Design a protein around this ligand. Sequence first.
Ligand code: RAM
Ligand code: RAM
Ligand code: RAM
Ligand code: RAM
Ligand code: RAM
Ligand code: RAM
Lengths: 284, 284
Amino acid sequence: AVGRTCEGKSLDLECPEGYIISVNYANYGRNSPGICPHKSSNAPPCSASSSLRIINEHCDGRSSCSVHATNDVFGDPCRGVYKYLEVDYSCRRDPDCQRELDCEGNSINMLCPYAETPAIHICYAMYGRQTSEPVCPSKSISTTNCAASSSLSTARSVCEGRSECSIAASNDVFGDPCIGTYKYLEIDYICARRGRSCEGSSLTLSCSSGQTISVLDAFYGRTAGPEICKGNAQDQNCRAESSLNIVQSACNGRSSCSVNANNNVFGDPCVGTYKYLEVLYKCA
Amino acid sequence: AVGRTCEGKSLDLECPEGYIISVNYANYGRNSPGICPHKSSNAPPCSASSSLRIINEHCDGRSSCSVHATNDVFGDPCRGVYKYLEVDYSCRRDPDCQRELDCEGNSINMLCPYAETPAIHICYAMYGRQTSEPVCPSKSISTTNCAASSSLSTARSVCEGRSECSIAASNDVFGDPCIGTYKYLEIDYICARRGRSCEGSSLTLSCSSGQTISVLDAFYGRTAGPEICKGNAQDQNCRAESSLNIVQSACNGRSSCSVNANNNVFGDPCVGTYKYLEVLYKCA
Ligand SMILES: C[C@@H]1O[C@@H](O)[C@H](O)[C@H](O)[C@H]1O
Ligand SMILES: C[C@@H]1O[C@@H](O)[C@H](O)[C@H](O)[C@H]1O
Ligand SMILES: C[C@@H]1O[C@@H](O)[C@H](O)[C@H](O)[C@H]1O
Ligand SMILES: C[C@@H]1O[C@@H](O)[C@H](O)[C@H](O)[C@H]1O
Ligand SMILES: C[C@@H]1O[C@@H](O)[C@H](O)[C@H](O)[C@H]1O
Ligand SMILES: C[C@@H]1O[C@@H](O)[C@H](O)[C@H](O)[C@H]1O
């Protein structure tokens, strides 16, 4: 996939649910007259050498990113030349995740037994059918373009952040996305590090050994009762929009970050509930 | 994208024209009961550690590959267990290629000035329109799903193997794939190494410095007159089918290879024409 934006505007990259961005090429500069055309003469090819690393920091491993195509971000690789940002990227399932699959009627049991990586993160999920043989054969199949649009959200609502989760490949969980067709559940998961701080405090994330953070899930709000961050727990469906983007933007590609769990960073998604910041991440 | 095949069968991976295979995950083994099911009890997860490297050798950088899912290829990572091969891959434009673009009416001029890398290889080509602003703006646009299906074949027929090529973004070259819409030409190209041997001789390809071969184009046959491999030149539209696959299969992922230019390797694609083997490749 290719995205292009002119200097001064922002470029949005996105992948479908359960896929992340994998950057192949990036440049801020100019290598064609026909993109963001101005006048007049052709100049020598222009490329900011900084471009790839910056786009990797801003976008790799995320489902979504927005990058400003400006000299402040990239430097100016050719003064007096109207520039543009071009990215070539692929949307892939994260190869750091473990790949599981069971046919309809079975359950997938995930377990994160280690203390340092105790939290399940669901990377990808599909309840339905995307292929025929040799997956879960049955006489009762009429489609290979079947998926609950809810697959990842439901999987995450069941399992995200838990140390153990058993999830049924069943219509009672996901709904039935293709009546009449024998289905399967395909889930990719990772055992993540977890950080949590109560509202009013800071949260520090850390990777050792010259390793770097990739934030996988984050919310400022509350999804649990008062056994987590004792305080008023009236809204347990509370999540600041853009929590993940903010924490990814603060932390991805670094060895340490600190983020304040507070309303001045995330807004207040649930007035009168005592909130916390909970983050799942990996170190690579 | 995901491909799966049971032990004893072959797995075919393919990308559309101008895209190559980029492998994300591979395993020969068993990690699910529901894929290539047999009986009965679940065993511990089974993975050949060899799998990724082998699939990379067989498939990375190619538009197509076919791999036998067998113990001879991978070893046997779990005796007595019916296995399967699963690959997760992405199809991408080769980032080793230079990215060019000009609007309809202009020409793209490619040049390979160095002796050691004197041959143009066209990696990707699209004459048409795949996006709106900020590419080649015009009032006369009614589609962004327009491409000459001939784009890459025509580009290669014009330029492949030359040290200089100037190709017009024009209907007279590619045909008109979207009448009424102002078009552009997007070409990615690389300056390749070239090897050539006349039929009856061998051809050796070589990368220095612990670098490895990736074959980009190959034909056994003839496309030039008798100034190349003097001999009968009656068929100059002569190419053995599967030349590229054979040379990729002999050479990709190695530091040196030798291939005999002869009918016992490639068949005879043009009886009574004196043939040669011509290969473009890169070292990475
Ligand atoms: C044309 C203009 O020239 C200078 O102001 C800067 O180089 C800026 O990035 C460019 O867009
Ligand atoms: C084959 C069978 O048919 C319908 O009953 C349901 O869609 C069910 O989920 C499926 O497994
Ligand atoms: C309990 C308390 O209630 C209000 O002051 C705010 O919503 C604050 O964020 C919360 O912590
Ligand atoms: C079931 C059969 O068992 C042995 O013969 C081998 O391990 C073979 O790979 C497996 O498929
Ligand atoms: C806008 C214009 O319209 C038609 O004449 C042709 O399709 C031509 O290629 C295009 O550039
Ligand atoms: C000229 C000669 O003609 C026949 O013997 C074969 O086609 C051979 O391949 C070719 O080299």
